């Protein structure tokens, strides 16, 4: 009773073992939510990696290449030391900042149920059965929310995930296929 699966072929398999025997319908939602989160994350990661490999960084695309602004961290040096060895050169301040935005988003996905935050509750809205559906409601200039869009998004998600995993593996060690 889940959403559309593989377009060429379909297979649910490992789904009725937890959404009927182990868990229930509430677990179904949760699983889908997790999947969507991961998918989106993978997509963004993929794009970032692609950009880094290509060369479109601050030095190439804009007038500013000095990220550290005190730690002498230029974009040229970070674009010459690959993608995996560049994330470790990010200044602590910046890391802290990034963690902040993500934290805020996660908290929102946790407190603000529907339109506004809920002041009195035993637990957070998203910590209850079916707490997080997957959709945050963030639809700026929303073009459409149909039954095709969702499926497309999901597909792009898994694909992105696989792609980035493979990319990381190859940078690290002999993969298998070409890039």
């Amino acid at each position: 009773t889940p959403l559309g699966g593989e377009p060429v072929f379909i297979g649910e398999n490992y789904w009725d073992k937890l959404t009927l025997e182990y868990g229930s319908e509430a677990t179904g939602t949760y699983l889908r939510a997790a999947e969507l989160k991961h998918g989106r994350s993978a997509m963004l990661a993929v794009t970032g990696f692609a950009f880094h490999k290509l060369g479109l960084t601050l030095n190439n695309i804009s007038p500013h290449e000095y990220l550290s602004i005190r730690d002498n961290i230029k974009f040229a040096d970070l674009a010459a030391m690959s993608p995996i060895e560049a994330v470790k050169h990010i200044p602590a301040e910046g890391m802290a900042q990034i963690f902040a935005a993500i934290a805020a988003v996660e908290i929102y996905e946790l407190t603000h149920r529907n339109g506004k935050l809920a002041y009195d509750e035993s637990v957070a809205p998203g910590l209850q059965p079916g707490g997080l559906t997957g959709d945050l409601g963030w639809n700026p200039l929303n073009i459409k929310v149909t039954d095709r869009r969702r499926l497309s998004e999901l597909q792009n998600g898994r694909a992105a995930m696989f792609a980035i995993s493979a990319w990381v593996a190859a940078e690290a060690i002999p993969g298998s296929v070409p890039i």
């Binding site: 182990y22 229930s24 509430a26 677990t27 035993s122 910590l127 059965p129």
Partner: protein
């Protein structure tokens, strides 16, 4: 008439509709204190023990970057300081005021006709939602028993090191 657990003292009254009921109360605390508070205590003591039994073992082998590996879990606070320790317990407080909508004493808790012991509303995945009563009773017997094992456990893990001076 007589206790099921220890069959030579009288059966304790006012412990009937509870999950791990085997009639074990020789000192008679349930005669004197409210039973909803005692259950809520036993679950909470058990959940903190189960998290501390994982913690005490996993801390030896895994350590998060930025900290210092300590051979014995017991010596960890000294290796983390006091500021980090107070942050933990003061946030535990804030997590506990929100938990019971502000009714944090033995007189304010269980003042609503709702608010049964141990029901936090916590269930993000959906474990035990929409099922029957026998299955729910069975899974509640598992949380009590594993929590009682972990309390007497977390003694031994902590105590073993007290005498000796090396990890588990």
């Amino acid at each position: 008439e007589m206790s099921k657990a220890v069959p030579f003292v009288k059966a304790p009254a006012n412990t009937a509709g509870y999950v791990g009921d085997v009639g074990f109360d020789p000192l008679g605390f349930s005669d004197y204190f409210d039973m909803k508070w005692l259950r809520e205590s036993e679950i909470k003591h058990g959940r903190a023990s189960m998290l501390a039994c994982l913690g005490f073992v996993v801390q030896q082998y895994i350590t998060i970057p930025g900290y210092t590996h300590v051979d014995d879990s017991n010596l960890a606070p000294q290796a983390v300081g006091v500021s980090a320790m107070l942050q933990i317990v003061l946030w535990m407080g804030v997590l506990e005021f929100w938990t019971n909508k502000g009714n944090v004493t033995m007189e304010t808790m269980f003042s609503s006709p709702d608010r049964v012991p141990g029901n936090l509303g916590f269930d993000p995945m959906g474990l035990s939602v929409g099922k029957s009563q026998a299955e729910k009773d069975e899974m509640a017997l598992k949380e009590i028993k594993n929590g009682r094992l972990a309390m007497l456990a977390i003694g031994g893990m902590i105590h073993h090191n007290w005498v000796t001076g090396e990890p588990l």
